Amino acid sequence: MENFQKVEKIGEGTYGVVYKARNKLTGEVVALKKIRLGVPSTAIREISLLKELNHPNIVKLLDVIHTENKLYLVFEFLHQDLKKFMDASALTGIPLPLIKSYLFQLLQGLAFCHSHRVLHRDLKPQNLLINTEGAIKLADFGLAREVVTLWYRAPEILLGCKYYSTAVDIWSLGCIFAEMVTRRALFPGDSEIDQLFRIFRTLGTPDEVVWPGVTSMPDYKPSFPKWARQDFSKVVPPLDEDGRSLLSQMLHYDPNKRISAKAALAHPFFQDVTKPVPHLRL
């Protein structure tokens, strides 16, 4: 760890603190994450697998430094997160071609991870990183295998499913897609039940018709209030019918009906996809 010079604190997650740092051996500027824990053998093997999960839309894990019961992860550095970009673009809105490019790129990243049976599990604007070239990348990946944000949590997680699928990441990305379009979080819950009830108030209380097996889920309660579903024309205006159709498939209640990342890439919404350059003030 004497090989790195800290520049500034760039964030704090559930695992630990992230610093921008300079590698005294290569001159490289990196993101250094100190994992708060010595380190379990199961974690070392899993994190070593992530070093090989390389894709242009996945923040590169450069090195795993396991020294003196402490664990450090050395990552590729990107200059801004989607959260700051969305806040900076709030008066005007992110242009639809850039939203489309970012969604397409993230679906490429998820299609890759999911093909390797790797789930993110905690997608949110804060772990989506962007650069000046128009790229967007997924950070803080297969690490799951301040108050924690519930806004992007899939309903099967909230209802107590222990063995959830790659569909949880599609749900989170659908929530982020809606937020980029409307400039407001889709489901800003501040408790697990407020999160669930916000989802139910918009998409309708799920039942055995739309989600077979839902009433047998661990945290499902027959006493849940029964709300009627709302139109997507009301939920994400002024998004066009291609975008609303894709969003509806990413937000299906039944994880088995929810669109995969691979099928989403073929959706007619991406017929005119391009790669614009964002206006980044760094």
Ligand X SMILES: NS(=O)(=O)c1ccc(N/N=C2\C(=O)Nc3ccc(C(=O)NCCc4c[nH]cn4)cc32)cc1
Minimum CB distance to ligand X smaller for 217 or for 280: 280
Asked if 140 touches ligand X (CB under 6 A), the answer is yes
Is 31 or 236 the residue whose CB approaches ligand X more closely? 31
Determine whether the annotation assigns residue 134 to a binding site: no
From the list 62, 59, 54, 94, the residue with the least C-alpha distance to 78 is: 59
Q: Annotated binding residue at 28?
A: no
Q: Which is nearer to ligand X, 85 or 187 (CB)?
A: 85
Q: Count of CB atoms within 10 A of residue 187's CB?
A: 23
Listed in sequence order, the DSSP H helices in the chain are: 41-50, 82-88, 96-115, 155-158, 167-182, 192-203, 232-235, 241-250, 261-265
Closer residue to ligand X, CB minimum distance, 76 or 242? 76
CA angle, corner 108, sides to 34 and 238, nearest 5? 105
User: CA-to-CA distance for 74 and 26, rounded, in angstroms?
Assistant: 13
The site string for ligand X over 60-99 (x = CB under 6 A, - otherwise) reads ---------------x-xxxxx--x---------------
Binding mask 191-230 for ligand X (x = CB under 6 A): ----------------------------------------
261: helix, strand or coil: helix
Choosing from 87, 122, 207, 231, which is the catalytic residue?
122
Give phi and psi for 8, each to the nearest 5.
-165, 155
Distance CA 211, CA 122 (A): 23
Please provide the size of the chain in residues. 282
Is 207 noted as a catalytic residue in this protein?
no
Residue list for the binding site for ATP: 10-18, 33, 76-78, 81, 124-127, 140
Annotated binding residues for Mg(2+): 127, 140
Write out the residues near ligand X by the rule CB under 6 A.
Answer: 10-13, 18, 31, 33, 59, 75, 77-81, 84, 126-127, 129, 139-140
